[PDB]
Design a protein around this ligand. Structure first.
Ligand SMILES: CN(C)CC[C@H](CSc1ccccc1)Nc1ccc(S(=O)(=O)NC(=O)c2ccc(N3CCN(Cc4ccccc4-c4ccc(Cl)cc4)CC3)cc2)cc1[N+](=O)[O-]
Length: 161
């Protein structure tokens, strides 16, 4: 088994890559290193990724640019990694006023939108910062709750699979 921070980064990388294969064009597989990521380290990791993909898709349909436009995530220009982090962390600090599995699904959904828009151009460093930022934020704020809910494995029963 692995520490929660490593389990959360491993699960963030596999959900982002799997979501990219879903896209008409996948840019992420080439621009990210999948050599040191093993979902096998995460307990029940495959079903967690399948569960998170089912839940994030239902979320994307239900809920459909103010700061993305400011941060130029859709630009070819190198981005401000420092500013996107404060904005992402603050956006997450607002989301987790209430802590439920549904709010966790939304955080992964936001990371998917930011990572997939960033991927069109090779902003690998920003995507990696965001994956690390999700991992650090989850270890600090979401870990006690995620732990008291069967862990990341809790998403498997929440999904209904
Ligand atoms: C059965 N089937 C026919 C219906 C499936 C229903 C409806 S779809 C859905 C709803 C919530 C989360 C995910 C998907 N499923 C469901 C229903 C409820 C729940 S829940 O009770 O556990 N959670 C919620 O109901 C919930 C959670 C978060 C939530 N948000 C709405 C607003 N967004 C906006 C937002 C605010 C601040 C910062 C960022 C964002 C944000 C986040 C992501 C994006 Cl992509 C864009 C903006 C935050 C999250 C809304 C509802 C979970 C789920 N679920 O797990 O899928």
């Amino acid at each position: 088994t692995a520490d929660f921070r490593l389990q959360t980064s491993t699960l963030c990388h596999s959900f982002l890559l799997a979501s990219a294969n879903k896209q008409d064009t996948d840019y992420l597989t080439d621009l990210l290193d999948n050599t040191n990521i093993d979902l096998t380290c995460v307990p029940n990791g495959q079903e967690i990724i399948h569960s998170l993909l089912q839940l994030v898709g239902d979320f994307n349909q239900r809920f459909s640019e103010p700061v993305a436009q400011s941060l130029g995530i859709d630009s070819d220009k190198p981005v401000d990694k420092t500013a996107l982090e404060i904005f992402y962390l603050e956006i997450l600090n607002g989301l987790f006023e209430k802590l439920n599995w549904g709010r966790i699904v939304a955080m992964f959904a936001f990371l998917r939108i930011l990572v997939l828009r960033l991927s069109k151009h090779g902003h690998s460093d920003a995507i990696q910062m965001l994956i690390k930022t999700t991992s650090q934020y989850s270890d600090e704020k979401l870990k006690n709750w995620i732990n008291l809910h069967d862990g990341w494995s809790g998403l498997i029963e929440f999904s209904g699979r």
